[PDB]
Design a protein around this ligand. Sequence first.
Ligand SMILES: Cc1cc2nc3c(=O)[nH]c(=O)nc-3n(C[C@H](O)[C@H](O)[C@H](O)COP(=O)(O)O)c2cc1C
Length: 146
Amino acid sequence: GEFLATTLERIEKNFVITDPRLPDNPIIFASDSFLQLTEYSREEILGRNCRFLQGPETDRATVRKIRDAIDNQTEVTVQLINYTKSGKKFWNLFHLQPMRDQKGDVQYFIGVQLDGTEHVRDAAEREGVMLIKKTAENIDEAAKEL
Ligand SMILES: Cc1cc2nc3c(=O)[nH]c(=O)nc-3n(C[C@H](O)[C@H](O)[C@H](O)COP(=O)(O)O)c2cc1C
């Protein structure tokens, strides 16, 4: 009910945008597709760090890769198990990248999720990474003047 989707959030891809200037680098935008994937309402996740997607089978070494990328303000692509609101597991081929302003300073982080039933390799991995990187570039363009 609360927090009607902006045009940005109706882009037909799973993504979130966080603002590292708020304590705990919380979600400020979340696509309709992301909400369908994860089963949360937008009001339930705005202002929260994305770590709520993690659960018991999530590989914590992989989460550390993401933590390190955020702290060093660089991109990363990983695969990890995430959980919906109701506890359904999915593999997440995940890409993070910072969005920089006109002075090169990081203003937001963009995260793109490609959900699947399995850890992917070879062609499926390559095509997945192609898709989430292109999507991240599209969101970078969309978010530039937010
Ligand atoms: C833009 C953005 C999107 C993120 N999306 C996911 C996600 O899809 N799945 C996930 O497990 N973590 C995601 N994270 C990572 C967590 O929010 C967090 O950075 C990670 O758990 C490491 O920090 P922590 O050790 O304090 O939990 C995302 C982070 C950011 C900045």
